[PDB]
């Protein structure tokens, strides 16, 4: 009755995550000046280059050079020896207004409450009672391993670390009436960029003693756990020099690590009218409210939209058999307690607030008591 | 016992799909000259611009200007009146060699059979007996609606159509012992770019009579079906001018439309050593072989890898209760019949053949009898 499940995460300096953080830094900069900014900012990163591409309509005056470079500085790429330097990289901007055809169809002359969806699409929310934060253990551990690397890099415990890292965690689970119970960690992978001077054995020892053992509860680790630590043997070249980055290429790292489902939309760089983000946040909020409310132990929520239409086209609830109530009953409860119009979500989840850069690494869910992580008390 | 499920698809000229097709055109061009080319080609599209970014190590001599422009020509963007023209757009190239640190860790001096994975990561395969091609009806219909638009555009039946389109299909399903049974189409969305001269009513009538009714079996369509046709009211600006495109931003459109699961990796622009693609193809192949072999009606397969390691780190089978055999038994059958090392997958699925551009629109699965769509006869 046991099975394996694997999730991955990446660090703040993984080239794809760099792009997500910059895109949300641009979004936050606009919202600080114009809460109703329309933002669709894609970022591309390669050796020596940050490119901004997309559509922004805003009353703000934003210094893109400063915003991008400050974001890269925060990540830690501040010297050519590290492969990338905020002081001297190229920043290119290819930003235009929102298409007037889109503007007239989505929000122009529409009361905020009844604004249309900024696009069609589908979105999922997921929650599982296997952790206090209602997230799969596989991805929670994966995120925390990268966070520990960043912590030990910035505090100088491991000065040889560089910002680009990847982790992967395989957990053995037990089935429990549709719910899942973690038993043990089966395999951990860690690859992290490092300086030229540190040897492989020193790095592998540190990754086991100072990162994994400092992160993963001992009850999940045993003599049989498999460790793949710096399995490439050498990872000096990294960041954008090692691998092109793009916004929206870590959407499973951003959400549930393969558990639940995904509708395909990226989060970073998008204002609240773009339901790919806001509706995914709302769907998480619904799912966690159902689990924390004791109606189920594990649940998947789908919603979908049409461009220009405020009300969702479909809503679906899948509880994996972990509720006494039928899925139909849960759907009725959701409809009585939630209003998933984008012009209502924005108020409930405070999505004009410039807090988006905080979401763009280590997952959008399970952390920091964002509004979508604070369950709603359900009436039924 | 009924529920809704929604999937979307996009056309060949959706800016994200444009990028996928160009990336695979570049991949195919290299493989035509060098079957062992190492390719990691990202594409970015915005008004007037195609940018290539990434890492290629190859003995080929490729004319990127010709390959990109020929791909855009094939899609149909051949005049400024359409928003984009292969003859006069900018093509920028930021391509470098594969990182030597990656090269030494993955494939250098390693027998082809025992080559390491080109990265860590997780991948899923999925199959469902609800259609002959073992795909969810929602996404099959969504793809076919875009294909019909492209057919009627290219054959001149609807000369006002332009290449950029999106569709979305909501199906009502019935539960059947873990399997799913389509009952009816609940909602269809179609948005497609059009010329300035055609009126909204003419377009909406054509989309219902010449596209939907020509694609969707009448048994699924009834008086209650909801149609959202050109719901924005105007879609003249489109393609990259309307919305920035990036490679790997339609990964759910590329796979199962929200059904099953996804590990996060993009397909287009990647050679066989990059398991994000090859292992996803192999996982589809496993899943379809199990369903077509009569061992289950609906199944999800996970695999995962570590960079530099040939053998998978984990394999998992989820059959939704649609088999008499346990999931453990199915896993044993998979292990006896499949070898999921990347240096074996390449031989079984012929992944050095330059056929990748054919996969980059209308989904990678359920079509064209690619090698991963031809089930393996299982011994057990
Ligand atoms: N030499 C290497 N060893 C391990 N991981 C690497 C190496 N070079 C790059 N990576 C990571 O793998 C990703 C994909 O190549 C990169 O973005 C980086 O995070
Ligand atoms: N005016 C419009 N109406 C409907 N869909 C549109 C419009 N403009 C662009 N789109 C589609 O929506 C996507 C996201 O904006 C675009 O890439 C395009 O496919
Ligand atoms: K890449
Ligand atoms: K976009
Ligand atoms: Mg990537
Ligand atoms: Mg997109």
Swiss-Prot record, chains A, B:
Question: Which enzyme type, at the first EC level?
Answer: transferase
Q: Which residues carry this modification: N6-acetyllysine?
A: 66
The UniProt record gives the binding positions of Mg(2+) as: 16
Residues annotated as carrying Phosphoserine in the record are 99, 369
Cross-link Glycyl lysine isopeptide (Lys-Gly) (interchain with G-Cter in SUMO2) position reads: 213, 219
InterPro entries recorded: ADOMET_SYNTHASE_CS, S-AdoMet_synt_C, S-AdoMet_synt_central, S-AdoMet_synt_N, S-AdoMet_synthetase, S-AdoMet_synthetase_sfam
Say which domain of life the source belongs to: Eukaryota
GO CC annotation: cytosol; methionine adenosyltransferase complex
CDD domains, alphabetized: S-AdoMet_synt (cd18079)
- Fetch the Pfam families from UniProt: S-AdoMet_synt_C, S-AdoMet_synt_M, S-AdoMet_synt_N
Binding residues annotated for ATP, in chain numbering: 14, 164-166, 232-235, 243, 249-250, 266, 270, 276
UniProt region (Flexible loop), positions on chain:
98-110
| Annotated catalysed reactions | L-methionine + ATP + H2O = S-adenosyl-L-methionine + phosphate + diphosphate
Q: Does the keyword Nucleotide-binding apply?
A: yes
Bound cofactor: record note: Binds 2 magnesium ions per subunit. The magnesium ions interact primarily with the substrate.
Annotated GO biological process: cellular response to leukemia inhibitory factor; cellular response to methionine; one-carbon metabolic process; positive regulation of TORC1 signaling; protein heterooligomerization; protein hexamerization; S-adenosylmethionine biosynthetic process
Q: Which Gene3D superfamilies match?
A: 3.30.300.10
Q: Which UniProt keywords apply?
A: Acetylation, ATP-binding, Isopeptide bond, Magnesium, Metal-binding, Nucleotide-binding, One-carbon metabolism, Phosphoprotein, Potassium, Transferase, Ubl conjugation
Q: What does the miscellaneous comment read?
A: Protein expression is regulated by post-transcriptional regulation: in presence of S-adenosyl-L-methionine, METTL16 binds and methylates the first hairpin of the 3'-UTR region of MAT2A mRNA, preventing recognition of their 3'-splice site by U2AF1/U2AF35, thereby inhibiting splicing and protein production of S-adenosylmethionine synthase. In S-adenosyl-L-methionine-limiting conditions, METTL16 binds the 3'-UTR region of MAT2A mRNA without methylating it due to the lack of a methyl donor, preventing N6-methylation and promoting expression of MAT2A.
Q: What is known about its subunit structure?
A: Heterotrimer; composed of a catalytic MAT2A homodimer that binds one regulatory MAT2B chain. Heterohexamer; composed of a central, catalytic MAT2A homotetramer flanked on either side by a regulatory MAT2B chain.
**Protein name per its UniProtKB record:** S-adenosylmethionine synthase isoform type-2
| Protein's organism | Homo sapiens
Name the lineage.
Eukaryota, Metazoa, Chordata, Craniata, Vertebrata
Q: Which gene encodes it?
A: MAT2A
């Amino acid at each position: 009755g046991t099975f394996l499940f694997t999730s991955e995460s990446v660090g703040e300096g993984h080239p794809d995550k760099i792009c997500d953080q910059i895109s949300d830094a641009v979004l936050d900069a606009h919202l600080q000046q114009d809460p109703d900014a329309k933002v669709a900012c894609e970022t591309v990163a390669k050796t020596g280059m940050i490119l901004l591409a997309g559509e922004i309509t805003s009353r703000a005056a934003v210094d893109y050079q400063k915003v991008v470079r400050e974001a890269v500085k925060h990540i830690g790429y501040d010297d050519s020896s590290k492969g990338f330097d905020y002081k001297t990289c190229n920043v290119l901007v290819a930003l235009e207004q929102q298409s007037p055809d889109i503007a007239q169809g989505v929000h122009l002359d529409r009361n905020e409450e009844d604004i249309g969806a900024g696009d069609q699409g589908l979105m999922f929310g997921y929650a599982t009672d296997e952790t206090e934060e209602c997230m799969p253990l596989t991805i929670v551990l994966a995120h925390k391993l990268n966070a520990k690397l960043a912590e030990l890099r910035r505090n100088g415990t491991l000065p040889w670390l560089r910002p680009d890292s990847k982790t992967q965690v395989t957990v053995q689970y037990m089935q429990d009436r549709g719910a899942v119970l973690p038993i043990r960690v089966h395999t951990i992978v860690i690859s992290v960029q490092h300086d030229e001077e540190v040897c492989l054995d020193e790095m592998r020892d540190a990754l086991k003693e100072k990162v994994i053992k400092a992160v993963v509860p001992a009850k999940y680790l045993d003599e049989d756990t498999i460790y793949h630590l710096q399995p490439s043997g050498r990872f000096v070249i990294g960041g954008p020099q090692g691998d092109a980055g793009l916004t929206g290429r870590k959407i499973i790292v951003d959400t549930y690590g393969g558990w639940g489902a995904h509708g395909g939309g990226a989060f970073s760089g998008k204002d609240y009218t773009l339901v790919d983000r806001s509706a995914a946040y709302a769907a998480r909020w619904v799912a966690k409210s159902l689990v924390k409310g004791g109606l189920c132990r594990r649940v998947l929520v789908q919603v979908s939209y049409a461009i220009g239409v405020s009300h969702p086209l479909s809503i679906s609830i899948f509880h994996y058999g972990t509720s006494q109530k039928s899925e139909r009953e849960l759907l009725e409860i959701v409809k009585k307690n939630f209003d998933l119009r984008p012009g209502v979500i924005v108020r409930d989840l405070d999505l004009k607030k410039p807090i988006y850069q905080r979401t763009a690494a280590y997952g959008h869910f399970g952390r920091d008591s964002f509004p979508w992580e604070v369950p709603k008390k359900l009436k039924y």
